[PDB]
Amino acid sequence: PPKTPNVVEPYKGEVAICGLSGRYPESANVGELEYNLFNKIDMVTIDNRRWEPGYLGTPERMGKVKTITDFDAEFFGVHTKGAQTMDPMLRNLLEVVYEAIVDAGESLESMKGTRTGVYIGVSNNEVDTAYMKNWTDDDAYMVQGCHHSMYPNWISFFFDFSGPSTAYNTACSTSLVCLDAAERHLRMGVIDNAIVGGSNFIYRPATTKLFMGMNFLGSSTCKAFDESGDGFVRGEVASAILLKKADTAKRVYCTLVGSMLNNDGNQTNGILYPNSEAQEQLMTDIYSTHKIDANEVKYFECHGTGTQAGDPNETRAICNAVCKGKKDPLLIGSIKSNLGHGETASGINGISKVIITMHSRQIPPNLHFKNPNPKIPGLFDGRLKVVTETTPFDGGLIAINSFGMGGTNAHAIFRSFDKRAEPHPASDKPRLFTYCARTEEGLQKIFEEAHKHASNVEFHALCQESANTKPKSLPYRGATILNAEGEYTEIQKCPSKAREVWFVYSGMGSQWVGMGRSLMALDVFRQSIEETAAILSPFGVDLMSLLMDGTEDKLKEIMPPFICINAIQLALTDLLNSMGIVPDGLVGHSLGEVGCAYADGCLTRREAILSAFWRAKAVIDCEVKPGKMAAVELTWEEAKRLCPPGVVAACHNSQDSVTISGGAQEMTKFMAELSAQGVTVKEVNSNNISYHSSFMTEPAAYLKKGLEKEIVPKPRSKKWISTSIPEERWGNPEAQTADASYQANNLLSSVLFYEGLQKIPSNAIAIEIAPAGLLQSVIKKSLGQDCTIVALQKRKSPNNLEVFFSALGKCYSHGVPMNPLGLYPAVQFPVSIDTPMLSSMVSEAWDHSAKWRVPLVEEFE
């Protein structure tokens, strides 16, 4: 009952921005914003998305997002009634927050329960007026859908954050104020992450008229640093970012050197007048507290609203605080000239640009700068230089200002992260890319983007970090192969309920020429095979030679079959364990029980290989009179009785198929009599041996003598289902340890494969681990129709690596967690700054079939 206090201690490490996502004017994702910025494409357009271009005399041009009527409510657990009475800003912010979380290499399960704080910045509240004009019952949910305080809390509620959730309203500069609050809470030890963000949508044209009444808005776009500047144009943003401690971040766009805030105080020019002295003092304080050399700043994201009285003051402060002592012009710029003014969200816009400028290593150009402002001296003395074209920002510090109305200023400094990517052993060999999404089209787009970056392993690791989300959240599970000779792609909707995974190990007969030759490409498989070969070398067996240069004459003998099949089984088990597949159940045929023991942990590699070697030796050392085995299509009760003395029934494959084994004479005669009656007595090669019969009495004992000194008894887990000792003796001591007694019993007693398969659920995913897919038909007939059956290898296939990857992809698509990247050396985090952004894929991979209510113009009159 007592609660352990949390350790709240000051943090002296680095704070890094990991994820970024958002909706920007004429941009549905960060990628579109970057493309438009770097192509000098104006994001402010003239149309009737919100209101007619000229309604009530408002300015025609405006910055508007693509759509605000879309929301994946079912993902966030919001019923239709709640979603309808929900601000579009909040819905877009939730989607953007999830996209940013995914971008930072995190997932729903990883971010759940963490000490993360939400610092949303929102000021617009026109939705209340729209929805309350014709208020009726069922609209009470507006308390939890429209109230500003719910913008962060919802984010905290869905993601299960347990940190300070707050909504700030500081006009412009709100985003930087929230960033400062997040830094304050991070450095004091209350939280480890932050979800700093903000949004701003336009609904009320009368609000635009009100702003124009105070001369805020101009005629044309925001001509920042231009002599013709006379105002700004309103814009829309729904962006958010994720902050973390640099020692735990898996991706670091940049580092937050420090942020500070202040107020212009009292002045004789009015409350709505920028104070250059206050901004200069703020810059001096921030650059002196952190000991940052002001001459080291490479780019400066200014609050270039384009107003005549604003730009000169800001620039004066910048070249009195930053340009003092600089030996080269300081590159200044502002994103307002590109996508207009974001108002409460304006700050975030700048941050976004910074991240872009800190990710692509290029400074986006500034639009509408034709004639420098004569009132701005720095543009003629060479101290300042507006970036009118793409510039190669190599590295350093970037400073951002978000001066807002009233006088509350905010400044922040970011340091570039220089970890240029280096080649990986992978990125040239086939790889398995597994992911999940809400829609099939989104998953297909994700796979296309992954193929586009098939040569990047850091991107694959970042995608993997959030590729194990439960089906309940992301139902569409898919798998593809990058750098594949043959195209492969599987996508399927997986039910919320989780199915049971059952490893199935096949027995003899799976031998062929080239078994596992292709799989040698993988490092883990080759290492496993080499370890087995080294273990078996002291006994005069060259596993390597048999596996690679072996011929059919090799498999004609008994010893090579056993050795090779078992080695392949151990290698496949090691591969599966490395990928992180935990088998909920284990079953195996004859000679496969050793593989089940090894995979269950009751047996070791050496013990299993030596058990197999002893099994083969017990038959190639003591004389065994010739015999045969056949595949009679009799029932167990039919076959077991039909066989004469000596001939017995060995393995219960399925509901109608039974092995029969006996002496070469007894057999031939009984098989012939059978063939007379309609029965498929299809004989099988056994090197003239009859396993699991009375003949195996002498070898089994010998086997025991061989294995009594090697196999250390160990408990058998409930996962492993014995196929040699019936259920009536499972509780008996003999069925507790897989010692030499178990090996002798399974080599002697009949194999109850059908009884073991009966225990498997009706919808379990059974993976057949063996050199070839033998028991596919038997297993399929055994379990039923609702179970998934996969074979890791195919006989005489031209490329077994592709078959293995396709099998794993299908298994994942049917809802089993796995780690495809576990077959290669782990990627060192944080990833290189060259890794692409994962936010765009999730942004374009949403389920937006339904359309929700949006404020209408007519509701504001």
JSON list of N, CA, C and O in Angstrom, two decimals, residues 119-167:
[
{"chain": "A", "resi": 119, "resn": "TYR", "atom": "N", "xyz": [2.62, 20.61, -22.54]},
{"chain": "A", "resi": 119, "resn": "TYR", "atom": "CA", "xyz": [2.71, 22.07, -22.41]},
{"chain": "A", "resi": 119, "resn": "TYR", "atom": "C", "xyz": [2.05, 22.74, -23.60]},
{"chain": "A", "resi": 119, "resn": "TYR", "atom": "O", "xyz": [2.65, 23.57, -24.29]},
{"chain": "A", "resi": 120, "resn": "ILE", "atom": "N", "xyz": [0.80, 22.37, -23.88]},
{"chain": "A", "resi": 120, "resn": "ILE", "atom": "CA", "xyz": [0.16, 22.82, -25.11]},
{"chain": "A", "resi": 120, "resn": "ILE", "atom": "C", "xyz": [-0.01, 24.34, -25.07]},
{"chain": "A", "resi": 120, "resn": "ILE", "atom": "O", "xyz": [-0.21, 24.94, -24.01]},
{"chain": "A", "resi": 121, "resn": "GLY", "atom": "N", "xyz": [0.12, 24.96, -26.24]},
{"chain": "A", "resi": 121, "resn": "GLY", "atom": "CA", "xyz": [-0.14, 26.38, -26.39]},
{"chain": "A", "resi": 121, "resn": "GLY", "atom": "C", "xyz": [-1.28, 26.65, -27.34]},
{"chain": "A", "resi": 121, "resn": "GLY", "atom": "O", "xyz": [-1.16, 26.43, -28.55]},
{"chain": "A", "resi": 122, "resn": "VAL", "atom": "N", "xyz": [-2.41, 27.14, -26.82]},
{"chain": "A", "resi": 122, "resn": "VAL", "atom": "CA", "xyz": [-3.60, 27.39, -27.61]},
{"chain": "A", "resi": 122, "resn": "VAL", "atom": "C", "xyz": [-4.30, 28.62, -27.06]},
{"chain": "A", "resi": 122, "resn": "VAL", "atom": "O", "xyz": [-4.37, 28.82, -25.85]},
{"chain": "A", "resi": 123, "resn": "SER", "atom": "N", "xyz": [-4.83, 29.45, -27.97]},
{"chain": "A", "resi": 123, "resn": "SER", "atom": "CA", "xyz": [-5.52, 30.67, -27.58]},
{"chain": "A", "resi": 123, "resn": "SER", "atom": "C", "xyz": [-6.90, 30.76, -28.23]},
{"chain": "A", "resi": 123, "resn": "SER", "atom": "O", "xyz": [-7.85, 31.27, -27.62]},
{"chain": "A", "resi": 124, "resn": "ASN", "atom": "N", "xyz": [-7.02, 30.27, -29.46]},
{"chain": "A", "resi": 124, "resn": "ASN", "atom": "CA", "xyz": [-8.28, 30.38, -30.19]},
{"chain": "A", "resi": 124, "resn": "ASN", "atom": "C", "xyz": [-9.39, 29.64, -29.45]},
{"chain": "A", "resi": 124, "resn": "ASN", "atom": "O", "xyz": [-9.22, 28.49, -29.04]},
{"chain": "A", "resi": 125, "resn": "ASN", "atom": "N", "xyz": [-10.53, 30.31, -29.28]},
{"chain": "A", "resi": 125, "resn": "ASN", "atom": "CA", "xyz": [-11.69, 29.72, -28.62]},
{"chain": "A", "resi": 125, "resn": "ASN", "atom": "C", "xyz": [-12.98, 30.08, -29.34]},
{"chain": "A", "resi": 125, "resn": "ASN", "atom": "O", "xyz": [-14.04, 30.18, -28.71]},
{"chain": "A", "resi": 126, "resn": "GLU", "atom": "N", "xyz": [-12.92, 30.26, -30.66]},
{"chain": "A", "resi": 126, "resn": "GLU", "atom": "CA", "xyz": [-14.11, 30.62, -31.43]},
{"chain": "A", "resi": 126, "resn": "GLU", "atom": "C", "xyz": [-15.06, 29.45, -31.59]},
{"chain": "A", "resi": 126, "resn": "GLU", "atom": "O", "xyz": [-16.24, 29.66, -31.90]},
{"chain": "A", "resi": 127, "resn": "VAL", "atom": "N", "xyz": [-14.59, 28.21, -31.37]},
{"chain": "A", "resi": 127, "resn": "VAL", "atom": "CA", "xyz": [-15.47, 27.05, -31.51]},
{"chain": "A", "resi": 127, "resn": "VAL", "atom": "C", "xyz": [-16.59, 27.11, -30.48]},
{"chain": "A", "resi": 127, "resn": "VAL", "atom": "O", "xyz": [-17.71, 26.66, -30.75]},
{"chain": "A", "resi": 128, "resn": "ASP", "atom": "N", "xyz": [-16.31, 27.63, -29.29]},
{"chain": "A", "resi": 128, "resn": "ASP", "atom": "CA", "xyz": [-17.35, 27.76, -28.28]},
{"chain": "A", "resi": 128, "resn": "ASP", "atom": "C", "xyz": [-18.52, 28.58, -28.80]},
{"chain": "A", "resi": 128, "resn": "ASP", "atom": "O", "xyz": [-19.68, 28.16, -28.69]},
{"chain": "A", "resi": 129, "resn": "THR", "atom": "N", "xyz": [-18.24, 29.74, -29.39]},
{"chain": "A", "resi": 129, "resn": "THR", "atom": "CA", "xyz": [-19.32, 30.58, -29.91]},
{"chain": "A", "resi": 129, "resn": "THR", "atom": "C", "xyz": [-20.08, 29.85, -31.02]},
{"chain": "A", "resi": 129, "resn": "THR", "atom": "O", "xyz": [-21.31, 29.93, -31.08]},
{"chain": "A", "resi": 130, "resn": "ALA", "atom": "N", "xyz": [-19.37, 29.15, -31.90]},
{"chain": "A", "resi": 130, "resn": "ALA", "atom": "CA", "xyz": [-20.03, 28.45, -32.99]},
{"chain": "A", "resi": 130, "resn": "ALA", "atom": "C", "xyz": [-20.97, 27.37, -32.47]},
{"chain": "A", "resi": 130, "resn": "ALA", "atom": "O", "xyz": [-22.10, 27.24, -32.95]},
{"chain": "A", "resi": 131, "resn": "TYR", "atom": "N", "xyz": [-20.52, 26.59, -31.49]},
{"chain": "A", "resi": 131, "resn": "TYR", "atom": "CA", "xyz": [-21.31, 25.46, -31.01]},
{"chain": "A", "resi": 131, "resn": "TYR", "atom": "C", "xyz": [-22.41, 25.86, -30.03]},
{"chain": "A", "resi": 131, "resn": "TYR", "atom": "O", "xyz": [-23.39, 25.12, -29.89]},
{"chain": "A", "resi": 132, "resn": "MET", "atom": "N", "xyz": [-22.27, 27.00, -29.36]},
{"chain": "A", "resi": 132, "resn": "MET", "atom": "CA", "xyz": [-23.26, 27.46, -28.39]},
{"chain": "A", "resi": 132, "resn": "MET", "atom": "C", "xyz": [-24.33, 28.36, -29.00]},
{"chain": "A", "resi": 132, "resn": "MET", "atom": "O", "xyz": [-25.27, 28.74, -28.29]},
{"chain": "A", "resi": 133, "resn": "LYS", "atom": "N", "xyz": [-24.22, 28.71, -30.28]},
{"chain": "A", "resi": 133, "resn": "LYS", "atom": "CA", "xyz": [-25.24, 29.55, -30.91]},
{"chain": "A", "resi": 133, "resn": "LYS", "atom": "C", "xyz": [-26.59, 28.84, -30.93]},
{"chain": "A", "resi": 133, "resn": "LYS", "atom": "O", "xyz": [-27.62, 29.44, -30.61]},
{"chain": "A", "resi": 134, "resn": "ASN", "atom": "N", "xyz": [-26.60, 27.56, -31.30]},
{"chain": "A", "resi": 134, "resn": "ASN", "atom": "CA", "xyz": [-27.82, 26.77, -31.36]},
{"chain": "A", "resi": 134, "resn": "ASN", "atom": "C", "xyz": [-27.71, 25.58, -30.42]},
{"chain": "A", "resi": 134, "resn": "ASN", "atom": "O", "xyz": [-28.05, 24.45, -30.78]},
{"chain": "A", "resi": 135, "resn": "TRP", "atom": "N", "xyz": [-27.23, 25.83, -29.20]},
{"chain": "A", "resi": 135, "resn": "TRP", "atom": "CA", "xyz": [-26.94, 24.76, -28.27]},
{"chain": "A", "resi": 135, "resn": "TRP", "atom": "C", "xyz": [-28.19, 23.93, -27.98]},
{"chain": "A", "resi": 135, "resn": "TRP", "atom": "O", "xyz": [-29.29, 24.47, -27.79]},
{"chain": "A", "resi": 136, "resn": "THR", "atom": "N", "xyz": [-28.02, 22.61, -27.96]},
{"chain": "A", "resi": 136, "resn": "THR", "atom": "CA", "xyz": [-29.07, 21.68, -27.58]},
{"chain": "A", "resi": 136, "resn": "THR", "atom": "C", "xyz": [-28.45, 20.60, -26.70]},
{"chain": "A", "resi": 136, "resn": "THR", "atom": "O", "xyz": [-27.23, 20.54, -26.53]},
{"chain": "A", "resi": 137, "resn": "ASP", "atom": "N", "xyz": [-29.30, 19.76, -26.13]},
{"chain": "A", "resi": 137, "resn": "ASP", "atom": "CA", "xyz": [-28.81, 18.65, -25.33]},
{"chain": "A", "resi": 137, "resn": "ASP", "atom": "C", "xyz": [-27.87, 17.78, -26.16]},
{"chain": "A", "resi": 137, "resn": "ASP", "atom": "O", "xyz": [-27.84, 17.86, -27.39]},
{"chain": "A", "resi": 138, "resn": "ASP", "atom": "N", "xyz": [-27.09, 16.95, -25.45]},
{"chain": "A", "resi": 138, "resn": "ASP", "atom": "CA", "xyz": [-26.05, 16.06, -25.95]},
{"chain": "A", "resi": 138, "resn": "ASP", "atom": "C", "xyz": [-24.75, 16.83, -26.24]},
{"chain": "A", "resi": 138, "resn": "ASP", "atom": "O", "xyz": [-23.76, 16.20, -26.62]},
{"chain": "A", "resi": 139, "resn": "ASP", "atom": "N", "xyz": [-24.72, 18.15, -26.06]},
{"chain": "A", "resi": 139, "resn": "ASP", "atom": "CA", "xyz": [-23.53, 18.95, -26.30]},
{"chain": "A", "resi": 139, "resn": "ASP", "atom": "C", "xyz": [-22.73, 19.22, -25.03]},
{"chain": "A", "resi": 139, "resn": "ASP", "atom": "O", "xyz": [-21.75, 19.96, -25.08]},
{"chain": "A", "resi": 140, "resn": "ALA", "atom": "N", "xyz": [-23.13, 18.63, -23.90]},
{"chain": "A", "resi": 140, "resn": "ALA", "atom": "CA", "xyz": [-22.39, 18.84, -22.66]},
{"chain": "A", "resi": 140, "resn": "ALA", "atom": "C", "xyz": [-20.95, 18.37, -22.78]},
{"chain": "A", "resi": 140, "resn": "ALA", "atom": "O", "xyz": [-20.04, 18.96, -22.18]},
{"chain": "A", "resi": 141, "resn": "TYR", "atom": "N", "xyz": [-20.71, 17.33, -23.59]},
{"chain": "A", "resi": 141, "resn": "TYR", "atom": "CA", "xyz": [-19.36, 16.80, -23.76]},
{"chain": "A", "resi": 141, "resn": "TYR", "atom": "C", "xyz": [-18.37, 17.87, -24.20]},
{"chain": "A", "resi": 141, "resn": "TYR", "atom": "O", "xyz": [-17.15, 17.63, -24.16]},
{"chain": "A", "resi": 142, "resn": "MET", "atom": "N", "xyz": [-18.85, 19.06, -24.58]},
{"chain": "A", "resi": 142, "resn": "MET", "atom": "CA", "xyz": [-17.95, 20.16, -24.91]},
{"chain": "A", "resi": 142, "resn": "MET", "atom": "C", "xyz": [-17.01, 20.50, -23.76]},
{"chain": "A", "resi": 142, "resn": "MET", "atom": "O", "xyz": [-15.93, 21.04, -24.01]},
{"chain": "A", "resi": 143, "resn": "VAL", "atom": "N", "xyz": [-17.38, 20.19, -22.52]},
{"chain": "A", "resi": 143, "resn": "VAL", "atom": "CA", "xyz": [-16.45, 20.43, -21.41]},
{"chain": "A", "resi": 143, "resn": "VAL", "atom": "C", "xyz": [-15.16, 19.65, -21.62]},
{"chain": "A", "resi": 143, "resn": "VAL", "atom": "O", "xyz": [-14.06, 20.17, -21.40]},
{"chain": "A", "resi": 144, "resn": "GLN", "atom": "N", "xyz": [-15.27, 18.39, -22.05]},
{"chain": "A", "resi": 144, "resn": "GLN", "atom": "CA", "xyz": [-14.11, 17.53, -22.24]},
{"chain": "A", "resi": 144, "resn": "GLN", "atom": "C", "xyz": [-13.60, 17.53, -23.67]},
{"chain": "A", "resi": 144, "resn": "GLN", "atom": "O", "xyz": [-12.64, 16.80, -23.96]},
{"chain": "A", "resi": 145, "resn": "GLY", "atom": "N", "xyz": [-14.20, 18.30, -24.57]},
{"chain": "A", "resi": 145, "resn": "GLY", "atom": "CA", "xyz": [-13.80, 18.31, -25.96]},
{"chain": "A", "resi": 145, "resn": "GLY", "atom": "C", "xyz": [-13.42, 19.68, -26.48]},
{"chain": "A", "resi": 145, "resn": "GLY", "atom": "O", "xyz": [-12.65, 19.79, -27.45]},
{"chain": "A", "resi": 146, "resn": "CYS", "atom": "N", "xyz": [-13.93, 20.74, -25.86]},
{"chain": "A", "resi": 146, "resn": "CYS", "atom": "CA", "xyz": [-13.72, 22.10, -26.33]},
{"chain": "A", "resi": 146, "resn": "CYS", "atom": "C", "xyz": [-12.92, 22.97, -25.37]},
{"chain": "A", "resi": 146, "resn": "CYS", "atom": "O", "xyz": [-12.26, 23.91, -25.82]},
{"chain": "A", "resi": 147, "resn": "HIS", "atom": "N", "xyz": [-12.96, 22.68, -24.07]},
{"chain": "A", "resi": 147, "resn": "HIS", "atom": "CA", "xyz": [-12.21, 23.48, -23.11]},
{"chain": "A", "resi": 147, "resn": "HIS", "atom": "C", "xyz": [-10.72, 23.42, -23.41]},
{"chain": "A", "resi": 147, "resn": "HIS", "atom": "O", "xyz": [-10.17, 22.35, -23.71]},
{"chain": "A", "resi": 148, "resn": "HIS", "atom": "N", "xyz": [-10.05, 24.57, -23.31]},
{"chain": "A", "resi": 148, "resn": "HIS", "atom": "CA", "xyz": [-8.63, 24.63, -23.64]},
{"chain": "A", "resi": 148, "resn": "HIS", "atom": "C", "xyz": [-7.81, 23.76, -22.70]},
{"chain": "A", "resi": 148, "resn": "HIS", "atom": "O", "xyz": [-6.84, 23.12, -23.12]},
{"chain": "A", "resi": 149, "resn": "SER", "atom": "N", "xyz": [-8.18, 23.72, -21.42]},
{"chain": "A", "resi": 149, "resn": "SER", "atom": "CA", "xyz": [-7.44, 22.91, -20.46]},
{"chain": "A", "resi": 149, "resn": "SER", "atom": "C", "xyz": [-7.42, 21.44, -20.84]},
{"chain": "A", "resi": 149, "resn": "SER", "atom": "O", "xyz": [-6.54, 20.70, -20.39]},
{"chain": "A", "resi": 150, "resn": "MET", "atom": "N", "xyz": [-8.37, 20.99, -21.66]},
{"chain": "A", "resi": 150, "resn": "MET", "atom": "CA", "xyz": [-8.42, 19.60, -22.10]},
{"chain": "A", "resi": 150, "resn": "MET", "atom": "C", "xyz": [-7.45, 19.30, -23.24]},
{"chain": "A", "resi": 150, "resn": "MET", "atom": "O", "xyz": [-7.20, 18.12, -23.51]},
{"chain": "A", "resi": 151, "resn": "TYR", "atom": "N", "xyz": [-6.90, 20.32, -23.90]},
{"chain": "A", "resi": 151, "resn": "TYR", "atom": "CA", "xyz": [-5.95, 20.07, -24.97]},
{"chain": "A", "resi": 151, "resn": "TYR", "atom": "C", "xyz": [-4.74, 19.28, -24.48]},
{"chain": "A", "resi": 151, "resn": "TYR", "atom": "O", "xyz": [-4.40, 18.26, -25.10]},
{"chain": "A", "resi": 152, "resn": "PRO", "atom": "N", "xyz": [-4.06, 19.69, -23.41]},
{"chain": "A", "resi": 152, "resn": "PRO", "atom": "CA", "xyz": [-2.96, 18.84, -22.90]},
{"chain": "A", "resi": 152, "resn": "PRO", "atom": "C", "xyz": [-3.46, 17.61, -22.17]},
{"chain": "A", "resi": 152, "resn": "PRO", "atom": "O", "xyz": [-2.91, 16.52, -22.37]},
{"chain": "A", "resi": 153, "resn": "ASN", "atom": "N", "xyz": [-4.49, 17.75, -21.34]},
{"chain": "A", "resi": 153, "resn": "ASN", "atom": "CA", "xyz": [-4.94, 16.64, -20.51]},
{"chain": "A", "resi": 153, "resn": "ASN", "atom": "C", "xyz": [-5.31, 15.43, -21.36]},
{"chain": "A", "resi": 153, "resn": "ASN", "atom": "O", "xyz": [-4.93, 14.30, -21.03]},
{"chain": "A", "resi": 154, "resn": "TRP", "atom": "N", "xyz": [-6.05, 15.65, -22.45]},
{"chain": "A", "resi": 154, "resn": "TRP", "atom": "CA", "xyz": [-6.37, 14.54, -23.35]},
{"chain": "A", "resi": 154, "resn": "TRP", "atom": "C", "xyz": [-5.10, 13.83, -23.80]},
{"chain": "A", "resi": 154, "resn": "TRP", "atom": "O", "xyz": [-5.01, 12.60, -23.74]},
{"chain": "A", "resi": 155, "resn": "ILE", "atom": "N", "xyz": [-4.09, 14.60, -24.22]},
{"chain": "A", "resi": 155, "resn": "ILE", "atom": "CA", "xyz": [-2.82, 14.01, -24.61]},
{"chain": "A", "resi": 155, "resn": "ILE", "atom": "C", "xyz": [-2.24, 13.21, -23.46]},
{"chain": "A", "resi": 155, "resn": "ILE", "atom": "O", "xyz": [-1.70, 12.11, -23.65]},
{"chain": "A", "resi": 156, "resn": "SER", "atom": "N", "xyz": [-2.33, 13.74, -22.24]},
{"chain": "A", "resi": 156, "resn": "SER", "atom": "CA", "xyz": [-1.87, 13.00, -21.07]},
{"chain": "A", "resi": 156, "resn": "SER", "atom": "C", "xyz": [-2.76, 11.79, -20.80]},
{"chain": "A", "resi": 156, "resn": "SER", "atom": "O", "xyz": [-2.26, 10.76, -20.34]},
{"chain": "A", "resi": 157, "resn": "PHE", "atom": "N", "xyz": [-4.06, 11.90, -21.08]},
{"chain": "A", "resi": 157, "resn": "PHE", "atom": "CA", "xyz": [-4.97, 10.80, -20.76]},
{"chain": "A", "resi": 157, "resn": "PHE", "atom": "C", "xyz": [-4.77, 9.63, -21.72]},
{"chain": "A", "resi": 157, "resn": "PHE", "atom": "O", "xyz": [-4.72, 8.47, -21.30]},
{"chain": "A", "resi": 158, "resn": "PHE", "atom": "N", "xyz": [-4.66, 9.91, -23.02]},
{"chain": "A", "resi": 158, "resn": "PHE", "atom": "CA", "xyz": [-4.54, 8.84, -24.00]},
{"chain": "A", "resi": 158, "resn": "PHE", "atom": "C", "xyz": [-3.20, 8.12, -23.88]},
{"chain": "A", "resi": 158, "resn": "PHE", "atom": "O", "xyz": [-3.15, 6.89, -23.87]},
{"chain": "A", "resi": 159, "resn": "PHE", "atom": "N", "xyz": [-2.11, 8.88, -23.79]},
{"chain": "A", "resi": 159, "resn": "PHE", "atom": "CA", "xyz": [-0.78, 8.30, -23.73]},
{"chain": "A", "resi": 159, "resn": "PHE", "atom": "C", "xyz": [-0.37, 7.90, -22.31]},
{"chain": "A", "resi": 159, "resn": "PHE", "atom": "O", "xyz": [0.73, 7.36, -22.14]},
{"chain": "A", "resi": 160, "resn": "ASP", "atom": "N", "xyz": [-1.21, 8.15, -21.31]},
{"chain": "A", "resi": 160, "resn": "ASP", "atom": "CA", "xyz": [-0.96, 7.74, -19.94]},
{"chain": "A", "resi": 160, "resn": "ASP", "atom": "C", "xyz": [0.23, 8.48, -19.32]},
{"chain": "A", "resi": 160, "resn": "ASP", "atom": "O", "xyz": [0.96, 7.91, -18.50]},
{"chain": "A", "resi": 161, "resn": "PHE", "atom": "N", "xyz": [0.44, 9.73, -19.71]},
{"chain": "A", "resi": 161, "resn": "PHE", "atom": "CA", "xyz": [1.50, 10.53, -19.11]},
{"chain": "A", "resi": 161, "resn": "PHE", "atom": "C", "xyz": [1.12, 10.92, -17.68]},
{"chain": "A", "resi": 161, "resn": "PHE", "atom": "O", "xyz": [-0.05, 11.13, -17.36]},
{"chain": "A", "resi": 162, "resn": "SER", "atom": "N", "xyz": [2.14, 11.02, -16.83]},
{"chain": "A", "resi": 162, "resn": "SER", "atom": "CA", "xyz": [1.97, 11.35, -15.42]},
{"chain": "A", "resi": 162, "resn": "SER", "atom": "C", "xyz": [2.83, 12.55, -15.05]},
{"chain": "A", "resi": 162, "resn": "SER", "atom": "O", "xyz": [3.53, 12.57, -14.03]},
{"chain": "A", "resi": 163, "resn": "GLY", "atom": "N", "xyz": [2.78, 13.59, -15.89]},
{"chain": "A", "resi": 163, "resn": "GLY", "atom": "CA", "xyz": [3.53, 14.80, -15.65]},
{"chain": "A", "resi": 163, "resn": "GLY", "atom": "C", "xyz": [2.64, 16.03, -15.76]},
{"chain": "A", "resi": 163, "resn": "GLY", "atom": "O", "xyz": [1.49, 15.95, -16.19]},
{"chain": "A", "resi": 164, "resn": "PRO", "atom": "N", "xyz": [3.18, 17.19, -15.37]},
{"chain": "A", "resi": 164, "resn": "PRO", "atom": "CA", "xyz": [2.37, 18.42, -15.43]},
{"chain": "A", "resi": 164, "resn": "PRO", "atom": "C", "xyz": [1.79, 18.68, -16.81]},
{"chain": "A", "resi": 164, "resn": "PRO", "atom": "O", "xyz": [2.53, 18.89, -17.78]},
{"chain": "A", "resi": 165, "resn": "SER", "atom": "N", "xyz": [0.46, 18.67, -16.90]},
{"chain": "A", "resi": 165, "resn": "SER", "atom": "CA", "xyz": [-0.24, 18.97, -18.14]},
{"chain": "A", "resi": 165, "resn": "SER", "atom": "C", "xyz": [-0.84, 20.37, -18.03]},
{"chain": "A", "resi": 165, "resn": "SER", "atom": "O", "xyz": [-1.62, 20.65, -17.12]},
{"chain": "A", "resi": 166, "resn": "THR", "atom": "N", "xyz": [-0.47, 21.25, -18.96]},
{"chain": "A", "resi": 166, "resn": "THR", "atom": "CA", "xyz": [-0.86, 22.65, -18.88]},
{"chain": "A", "resi": 166, "resn": "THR", "atom": "C", "xyz": [-1.11, 23.21, -20.27]},
{"chain": "A", "resi": 166, "resn": "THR", "atom": "O", "xyz": [-0.55, 22.73, -21.27]},
{"chain": "A", "resi": 167, "resn": "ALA", "atom": "N", "xyz": [-1.98, 24.22, -20.32]},
{"chain": "A", "resi": 167, "resn": "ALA", "atom": "CA", "xyz": [-2.27, 24.97, -21.52]},
{"chain": "A", "resi": 167, "resn": "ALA", "atom": "C", "xyz": [-1.90, 26.43, -21.28]},
{"chain": "A", "resi": 167, "resn": "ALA", "atom": "O", "xyz": [-2.37, 27.04, -20.32]}
]
